[PDB]
Design a protein around this ligand. Structure first.
Ligand SMILES: [Cl-]
Length: 259
C-alpha cells in the first residue's frame, strides 16, 4: 500500500500517466501500477526486434556477420551511429548494438526489415507467449504516442514478463541471451532513467524509449548487489503533444519500487 501511494503521488505530481511492473526473482513477486494499461513503447520495442534477429541467428550461424548497406535514403530522424556509416555497410551485430545502445533509428529499421517487418516482430512476440505487444509501424512514425491509440503499444506487465524471458529465461539460446544482456548492459541512453533511481553499485541492462506526448520509457534487467535479479518496466506519457521528456519520473519510480 505504501508503494502504491508513493507511485500515485509521483504520477500526480508529474501530471501524466505512469505504468510500472517490477518482477523480483528472489520471491517471484510483482509490484504493479497501471500494469495492464497500454503505453506507446517507442524504441523500447528494439529489444523485441533484436531478440527476433538473435533467434533467427540460432539456425543461421553467420547471420550476425551479414552486411547491410547504409544509404542516405535510410536516414531517419535520429541516426547517431548509422550517419557515420553512410555509403558503407554495417553488420547485423553492429546494427543490433546501435539500435539497443544508442536508439539509432536506422539500426532499428534494419532489424525490423530483416525479419520481415513490424508484423513479423509481433509474430515473434506471439511465439514467445506475449499476446499484448504490438509493433505496427517503423521508425519514426512508431513514436507518435497519441493518447488512446493502440498502435505500437504494450502493457508494463507483458513487457516485464517478456523481458524476463529474454534476459533471464530461455527464449534465446545461451550465446544469444548472453549477447542480448551484453548489449543492454552497454546502453548509453539510460543513465538518467531507471539507473538514476538505483544504488550506484547495482548492475543494469536497459533500453529506453521516447516520443510524442512527452513519452519517456525504460525497461531494465537489474542485478542488485548480492541479490536475485529484478526486471523493471517504467512507462510514462503526458497529456500535451509537445510535452518535454521526464526521465526523472522513471528514476523516481525505480527508487520507490526498489527501496
Ligand atoms: Cl549509491
Amino acid at each position: 500500500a505504501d508503494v502504491q501511494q508513493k507511485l500515485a503521488e509521483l504520477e500526480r505530481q508529474s501530471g501524466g500517466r505512469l505504468g510500472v511492473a517490477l518482477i523480483n526473482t528472489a520471491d517471484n513477486s510483482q509490484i504493479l501500477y497501471r500494469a495492464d494499461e497500454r503505453f506507446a513503447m517507442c524504441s523500447t520495442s528494439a529489444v523485441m526486434a533484436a531478440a527476433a534477429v538473435l533467434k533467427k541467428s540460432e539456425s543461421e550461424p553467420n547471420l550476425l556477420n551479414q552486411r547491410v548497406e547504409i544509404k542516405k535514403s535510410d536516414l531517419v530522424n535520429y541516426n547517431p551511429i548509422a550517419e557515420k556509416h553512410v555509403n558503407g555497410t554495417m553488420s547485423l551485430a553492429e546494427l543490433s548494438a546501435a539500435a539497443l545502445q544508442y536508439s539509432d533509428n536506422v539500426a532499428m529499421n534494419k532489424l525490423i526489415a530483416h525479419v520481415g517487418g513490424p508484423a513479423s516482430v509481433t509474430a515473434f512476440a506471439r511465439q514467445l507467449g506475449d499476446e499484448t505487444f504490438r509493433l505496427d509501424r517503423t521508425e519514426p512514425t512508431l513514436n507518435t504516442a497519441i493518447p488512446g491509440d493502440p498502435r505500437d503499444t504494450t502493457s508494463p506487465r507483458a513487457m516485464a514478463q517478456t523481458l524476463r524471458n529474454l534476459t533471464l529465461g530461455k527464449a534465446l539460446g545461451d550465446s544469444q541471451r548472453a549477447q542480448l544482456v551484453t548489449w543492454m548492459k552497454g546502453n548509453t541512453t539510460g543513465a538518467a532513467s531507471i539507473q538514476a533511481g538505483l544504488p550506484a553499485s547495482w548492475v543494469v541492462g536497459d533500453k529506453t524509449g521516447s516520443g510524442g506526448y512527452g513519452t519517456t520509457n525504460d525497461i531494465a534487467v537489474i542485478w542488485p548487489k548480492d541479490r536475485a535479479p529484478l526486471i523493471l518496466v517504467t512507462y510514462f506519457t503526458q497529456p500535451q503533444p509537445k510535452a518535454e521528456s521526464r526521465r526523472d519520473v522513471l528514476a523516481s519510480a525505480a527508487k520507490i519500487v526498489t527501496d
